[PDB]
Structures are given as structure tokens and as C-alpha cells.
Design a protein around this nucleic acid. Sequence first.
RNA 1: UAUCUGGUUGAUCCUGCCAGUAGUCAUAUGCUUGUCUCAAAGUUAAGCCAUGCAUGUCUAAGUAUAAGCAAUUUAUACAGUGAAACUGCGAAUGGCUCAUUAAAUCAGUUAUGUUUAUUUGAUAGACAUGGAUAACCGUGGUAUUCUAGAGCUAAUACAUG
RNA 2: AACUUUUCGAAUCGCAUGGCCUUGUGCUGGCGAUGGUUCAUUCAAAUUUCUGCCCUAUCAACUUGAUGGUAGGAUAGUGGCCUACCAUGGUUUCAACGGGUACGGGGAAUAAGGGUUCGAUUCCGGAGAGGGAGCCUGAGAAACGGCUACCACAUCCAAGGAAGGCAGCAGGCGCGCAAAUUACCCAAUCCUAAUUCAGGGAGGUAGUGACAAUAAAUAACGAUACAGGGCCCAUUCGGGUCUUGUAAUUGGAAUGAGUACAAUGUAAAUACCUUAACGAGGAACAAUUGGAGGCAAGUCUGGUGCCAGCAGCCGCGGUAAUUCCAGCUCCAAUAGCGUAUAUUAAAGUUGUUGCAGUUAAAAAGCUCGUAGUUGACUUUGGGCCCGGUUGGCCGGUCCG
RNA 3: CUCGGUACCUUACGAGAAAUCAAAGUCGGUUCUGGGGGGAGUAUGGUCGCAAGGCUGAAACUUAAAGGAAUUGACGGAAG
RNA 4: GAGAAUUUGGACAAACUUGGUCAUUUAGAGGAACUAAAAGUCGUAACAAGGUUUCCGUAGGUGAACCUGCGGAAGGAUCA
RNA 5: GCGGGAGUAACUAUGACUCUCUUAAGGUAGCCAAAUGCCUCGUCAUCUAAUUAGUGACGCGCAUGAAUGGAUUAACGAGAU
Lengths: 124, 80, 118
Amino acid sequence: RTYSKTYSTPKRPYESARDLLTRDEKDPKRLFEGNALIRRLVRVGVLSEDKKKLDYVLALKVEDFLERRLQTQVYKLGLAKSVHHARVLITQRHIAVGKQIVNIPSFMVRLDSEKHIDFAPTSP
Amino acid sequence: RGKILTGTVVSTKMHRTIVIRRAYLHYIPKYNRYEKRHKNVPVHVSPAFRVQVGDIVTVGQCRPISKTVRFNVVKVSAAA
Amino acid sequence: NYKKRLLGTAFKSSPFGGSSHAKGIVLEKLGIESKQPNSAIRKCVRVQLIKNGKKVTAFVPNDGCLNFVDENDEVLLAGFGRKGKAKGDIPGVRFKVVKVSGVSLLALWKEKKEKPRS
RNA sequence: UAUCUGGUUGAUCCUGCCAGUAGUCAUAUGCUUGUCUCAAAGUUAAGCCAUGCAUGUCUAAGUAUAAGCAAUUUAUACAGUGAAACUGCGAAUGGCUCAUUAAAUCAGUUAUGUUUAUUUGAUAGACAUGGAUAACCGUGGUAUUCUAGAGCUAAUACAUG
RNA sequence: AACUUUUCGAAUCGCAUGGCCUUGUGCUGGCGAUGGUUCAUUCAAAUUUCUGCCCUAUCAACUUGAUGGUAGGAUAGUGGCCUACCAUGGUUUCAACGGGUACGGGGAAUAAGGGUUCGAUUCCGGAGAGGGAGCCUGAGAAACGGCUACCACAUCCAAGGAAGGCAGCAGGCGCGCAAAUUACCCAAUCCUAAUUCAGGGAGGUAGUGACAAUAAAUAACGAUACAGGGCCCAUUCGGGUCUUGUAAUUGGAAUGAGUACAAUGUAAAUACCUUAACGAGGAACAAUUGGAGGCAAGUCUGGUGCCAGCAGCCGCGGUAAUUCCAGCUCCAAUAGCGUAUAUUAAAGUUGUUGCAGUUAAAAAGCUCGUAGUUGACUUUGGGCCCGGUUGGCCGGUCCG
RNA sequence: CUCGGUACCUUACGAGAAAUCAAAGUCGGUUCUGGGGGGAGUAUGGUCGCAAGGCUGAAACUUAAAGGAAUUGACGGAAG
RNA sequence: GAGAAUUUGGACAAACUUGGUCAUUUAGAGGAACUAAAAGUCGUAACAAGGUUUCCGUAGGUGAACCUGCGGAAGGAUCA
RNA sequence: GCGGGAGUAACUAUGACUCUCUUAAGGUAGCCAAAUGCCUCGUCAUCUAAUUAGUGACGCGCAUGAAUGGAUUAACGAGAU
């Protein structure tokens, strides 16, 4: 994801020529959020699709996709403690949005709507 | 095929059938200069035989009275 | 059609086909010197291929001066000099020897060192 | 909708070649080696091949083992009006390969002089007869393949009128 | 005169059910199904015209059953398909003929597009079944698992004589950079045979390998104690925000997988899915690879001494080496990392879009002229040719 | 003055890497020619020639540059 | 009247064997040349006007880089 | 008509070049083991049941060399393998 060990992940970059530019759209973007990959970011359209397919403000589009990811935005709620604990509470279909339990763990949802747990595993 | 092309007579000896040469004006794709082709087209006249060598004749489809000779010529225009 | 007579790019490699590497039964292990700007005796082998059947000379780098690539060694032969230009110090070689590979795996690896492999 | 860098020099700007940065491969090799879904997996000798398997199916095409006749096998409530055998229909479909082929091949567009099991629509006719024949039985010739003489018998097999 | 497609030659009965009537006791009536003929139709295959085709001219002459007519002969049919006779033409620098090379298209990769390089998987068409030859059977074959004669190989044999062809699947040997089990099955789809139902190494599945893409990704939380440097504010007393260390820290929560029990769907087989409770085990199933002089993010200390070594390029190593080698010290990416293959981009470096020639590589010594390419000009419609724009197929969107 | 050849000189616009050009600026129609240096105008074949030789015409391989425009300074059996 | 086998004749396809001719590959007596590589031999050719200005084409001759005849160029300043 | 003796290059191995003596003064283009070679079954490849010819070179030239001439180079024979 950058990186090295756990604690060091935000720190060798910067905050919470070539190399600094790909760090600049990365680190104040991580301040708000932070679930950025390498392989999957190509798909978002750094080379490939959506950023080349539409013109409209590409900085705000990389903002949009990660807040739509349920994983990163459940941290902002304070339900699932961790971001890569909300890795897990999406895959086992724990966080129900709708309420509707998820199909794919790759789920590109939205921030806006109400988050909760499904009925049975509510509050371990 | 349809439309009536050019065709001047080359070989004349025999009864009924002759040979014509056709010409076209095609573009060679990378050049974009025009070219011209040759084709041996055998073509049936009539049992009367009215063509000479040189004659521009009106070509069109008709019966295969020979397998290759699907063409007939109806109107003779020039004479040599 | 029209074009002037263009030649396609040619790798200066006497083996061909559509193959990355190649086996070779070898003749001798040599230790040849070099051109003007650098000294030291650099090790090489006379690799004769099986499929292509061409005589080539190949540079054998190793952390073993008399490392095992003998007379009748089934050694694997790669590029380096096919990729890029041919080497400045010792010319003629434009093939580099691979470690512990092929069918038989006779030629040995880099010994007496304990950094990561390569 | 296209951003170049380094190396010919004391230094500079052109010309110009080379080397490198990117995306990609039925992949191959070194090294490390923890999972999954989906997809792909002889490019070389269209080289030579062991062994097992890839081509059958109907009894709803018939005599119909009753009346009369050997032996064996299977089924049942009792009759078994019995079958597995000999015949007929497919093996040209499907699968594999690119040796060969600058081709009347193939690719665009067309054209006429033909054929076509099976399938599908409609009319009339569908009568009256004959002869052989496996299977089967008793014997006989061969290492095996392959079969010989002789007797009985059905058909939508065959031949008359 | 409006068009396109399709279309031909000699009997065969069996079965279920039933009233009247007739009977040489095998008719007749009703219903289902088949065979010979006659005319359609659907599906599929032939045959043929025209146009476009790769390089090499350090390949220039080639062509007699050859171009075509006449007649018969042959074919399902058009026909030099074939022969006899006659005429002497036909092809070619707009590239014949020869030699070398090559299956072709829908398409696949790369690119901004132009183009350049390819023709794997898939799908459509052609051609081939040890080698060479011929035929039959048949509607369809000059036939992979059909037949006959001949030749070479390997095999069996009583030595008289026979039996064979994995460019079908799995596998053996050899070739090689290198590529998987002598597995399971008729359920589903589709093909073959009135239906039942049987056959299928087609196919539907499984096993093998980071081979690649993809997602989870190489791990991340609420709360508390202590120490150091920097900044805002300061009533100078401290307070706020904030993390390279640290603690038997505390509360724990969490996947992937196994195992027992329950519950569920298809089965001929291998491995079963999902939710909740309880117990146990393991633990985000051990993180490595590459680089650190410039190009190209990132330096210091030891050891070695043109040796040992590294090298894509230019180069470094012969005493203070940021390039070798080891350490600690840094950078970049990560289940991939580096190298090798090869195509394309970079390359406006074969220029169609989109290139130069006074001095860098480049105007033929100079005239002249044919083929070829190009064309000042008035008024016109028709004819000929080039170039569109629109409609036919497929995909997305619209509808259920 | 008006026309053709135009030793040529000199120069603005403008162009070019620049010296410079005054079209070698810039335009068309058509033809020729170039794609790093060495190997090479060679090897070999064809063709021409009486013969020396001409014309057409490469590769293996080697290498990392060859080359143009413009500057400074030392030196001269150079000048002042 | 039919089938099998044998004999004769006609026409078609292709193979096999022998001879001539052309192209390609391998082995190869032998022969000529190049590139890279330290030290050498002989001369000072080129380099300043290198103390005969050079270079290119061509012809003759020499141990040797070479020398000489003939033509031309600036690749010697300046438009010789 | 056209020379001797002596010394000399990494390393097996050789003499570019240099010195010295002697005489009137010491040879080019091109070719070689001969109608000429003591030494020599020299030395190597291919051929042959053996094969030295066919044909391929070696260098170890007793003693090759431009006008009573080297060298380019087609046609012709009761002449030679």
C-alpha cells in the first residue's frame, strides 16, 4: 500500500519530483479517509478507466470512491473500530446497509445512507 | 454487377464468341495514384457475328452458354 | 507497393528460434583476459547449443572463481548483451550464464556469501 | 490529441546513432512461496508409437418358438399367445491437425445450368403370385484367420406376372 | 412485359378397436403409421462471373489439349469435363512465367489517431488421415477407427502364414527454454435411433502449477501510565493538539480452515453450502525480492587491494572505494520481485496523416526525348469515373 | 527611360542551429538522391571493353561515435 | 439367363529406376583478405608555411610510409 | 652482372631492425619443390578391399626472377595422365 510495517505506513510518506506528486494526492486524502491500493487505483483510471472517461474534478472523484467503500467510512461512524476490521465486517456480511446484507465484499456503496448491523450479530 | 462497362475486342476469328479487354480506374491504397487493369473476359456475340477487332460493345449478364461465357454483347457501337 | 528497403531490427545473437534461454553441453572452461581499460582474468565457457548448434562464448559471473561449469556441463545460457550492447571490457561475450538450471542442474550457484540470493 | 532524459565536447547549439524510462506475452529461468474465483496450459520432429478406451442403437420393420419339435437360460397371480439370436438404420455426423495451398483457394458483392437419405403439404393406387435363405441340427477341415458338404424355415431380403 | 427463391423418372405392409353383412373364413368400417408414384416446401451441398491479393526483376520471356470454335463422347448439371478436325491465337512490365515464403477472414496486441506488427484460445470456410495407387458400397465417401494389390518399418507365428497404423482422449520414447491424470459421469445442454430408454474420452466437471487478472491484499483498534525534541497560545503557572520508543498493560474483537451436531439442494463420483450456540486449535496460515555514482527516490563506516568481483549504457576495483564485499544506515513497490524472450510505443528514424539535400549523409557531368504522371481556357446537358450521406447485421439503451 | 542577359556589389522585411542567403526566403507540377562511423564503392554475379578498368552493388563482423557551425590560447624557418 | 475365374484389346491417374541440367547445405586439400591485441622493426608520410602546402582522381616506378607527371578544388585568408 | 659474419622483440618460438667486415656495387613486379631438389615413403586433406596418381596443400627454395623476356589468354591436332 506504500509501505512497511503497521505504524510506519502513513509516516514514511508524510501525514495521517515524481514521488512527491503521487504522495500529494495520497496523504491529505488519507487524512479524511485512507484505503488506497496500487493495482486497484490503475482501474479507477490513473492509467485506465473512469478518470480518463470523465473530465470532472479528478481529485474529488478519488474522494468519492473511498467514502462509497463501506470499509473506510464505518471508521467515521465508530461502530467497527478499525479500517481493516471493517475489512472483515463487510466480508462476513455483518454491516447491513438498507438494511440489506452485502453481496460482494468489494461493495461500492455510499456514505449518506444509514449504517447498522444486521439483527443477530448486533453488538458483540 | 449491373451497370454497362467498357470492353474493346482483342481476339476475333471464330464463330459466336470473342475475347474483350476491360479497363477500370482504381486507386492503389498507399499511392493514391490511379491504375488500370487487364482482364481476359470471353463474351458471346450472336450467331450472326457482327463484331470486328476494336469495337466498343455493351456488356451485360445473360445465359452461361459456356461456363466462363456468362456475358453477352447486344449493341455494337463502334466499328474498329 | 512502395517503400525503400527497410531491414527489421536484429539482435546480434547467433542462436535464434523463439526461445528465451538454451541448453548447451559445453567444450571447455576458459579464463580469458580483456581489452585496454581494465585488467583481471574474467571467466568464460565455450557453450555449444543442442537445438541451434552454434558456438558461442558466454561470461560466467559467480562468487566462485573456479566455480563448477566443467568441460561437459549442461549449462543454461541467457541474454545480457542480447539485451543492450555487448560488454566493453571483454568483448565477444554477449551471453551470460544462469545458475542451477536446465534439466540436469549441473552448474552451481554463488557460494561463500550469505546476502540474499540472485 | 502526442511533455523526454543520459552518453560524441574545454564549453555551446545543431545534426545523428545508441542506451533507458511505458504497456504487453499460451510464456521461460533464478529466488521466495500463504490462500481463492475465473481463464489458459507441445510453440521443438505432419517424428515413431505400447496398452485401455473414443461407434452404436431399435424388437415399436417381421416370422412371432401356440397347434408340432432337441438342449440350455430367465421371469410369474395364472396364462406365460414371451425376450436376450439371425436380419435392417449410423459409421460422410462429431472430434483432431495446418503438411499443403499466392491458389477459380479465401475474403466483398453476386449469378445459373443442377442434386437433395431424412423432414413437411396434397390426390389416386396399394392387387394377385412364385422361388430361395441364414439362425438352427447332426458331422467334417485348420495354428489362427477363414470356413466345407447336407437338411428344415420367415420377411418391408429377392424375383416374376 | 416487375422481381427473387424453390422445384423430376417403375408399389410393402404391419398395429389397436369393433356393429351389421359377406366369406374360398385372409373382407368391410374407423383410426394411427409406413412404403412406390405425382407435384410442392424446408434445410444442406455443388457450379460460376466480376473485383481486390506477399516479397523477389541480382527471376524476362512464357504458353499446343494452349486460347476458342466445330461436332460427337461423358456428366446430376454448366463446361475442352474429353477427343478428332480446323484457325493461329492467348498471357506479360497495369509484372506473365519461375524461385523463395505462407492456410484466409471475423479478430488479437500496441498507439492520441494515422499506422505498424501478428492470425494462439473462440467462430466461420478450405485442405489432410504411415507412403504412393485404385475401386466398391451409398442419397452423401474415391472414406481416420471401410476394402484390395504394392513398398518400407516394428510385432506375432506351429515357418505353412497372418495381424497392424494415436495429425481422437489419457499416456510412452525422443526432441526441448518449456507445458498438466493411463481421473469421474449421463444428471444438465446438444447429437444419433415412434416412446420408454440406451450410447457419447462430445460435453459437463475434478485434479495439477503464483500462469495471469481480481478481491481480501504484505495486519489495525478504544483506554491508561512515562520520557525527549518542535510550534501556537500564555493569566508564565501551565494547557492544548499531536507520535521513532516503552509496559507480565487492560478490554478484547476478528477472518481463512478443521471437527462434532442440526438444517438444505443436484448426484453415478471426489471434495458439501449456510446460520446460530458451545468447546478446542491455529492465527490475519512463517515475507521476501530489488535498488542506493549520473540517467533513477536513496550515505556513511569497516574489510579487500586490477585480486576476489559487479557491469544496460558511460564505467568502477592496483590503500582512506557513497559503484566490489559485509554491516548498520536509507528509498520504492509488494505476494510478487528481478532477469531473459519478442512485438509495439519512445521514432516526424521509411513521413499516407507528418521528414531532409550551400557547409553535417544527400541534385544524376550536361543536353534530348518515349512510355508514364500532371494540365491555360469560354457555354452546356448526357455519358464515364472518384468521393460521400442515408437504410439492411451486431452491441448498448428502451419494454417485461 | 524601357526591355533581356544579369561578373556582381550592398541591404530592410522575413527565415535558420548559426556563419550567411536575398532565395539556399518561399511555392506548386515532375524527376533524381540521403537514413551512424569502419568494413565499402570492396566482395560476388550480370553487363560493357582490345586491355588497363567502368557500370550495377552487399553481408558477416567490429565500435560508441564519426561529423557540421562558432570560441579561447600557445606556436610559426608569419607580417607590422 | 446370372455369378466367379481366366485370356486379349483400349484409354486414364501416379509411383519406381536410369541419364542430363540448375539451385541450396555440409565436409574439405588449398588460397587470399580483415578485425582486435601489449611489446618490436624501418622511415618521418600527415600535423605550424612540419621547413618541397595538402587531398582526391589517374598513369609509371621503388624495401617502405612513398616519389614523380597531368588536371582541379579551399577541404589555405578574401568571391582568387 | 645482381654478398658474408655477428647481435637482437613478454612466452614456447621467431627476427623486425641494427652493427660489422668485404667488393665495382648487392635485385623489383609476380611465381615455386620443376625437362633443374642432395635432403624425402617430407608434411597435410580427400580418395582406394591397399592408393604416393586422381587432388589438397605444406614451407624444410642442395641452386626462381622481366627483352635471344615476365604476363593477359580464345580457337585448332595420326601428340601426354
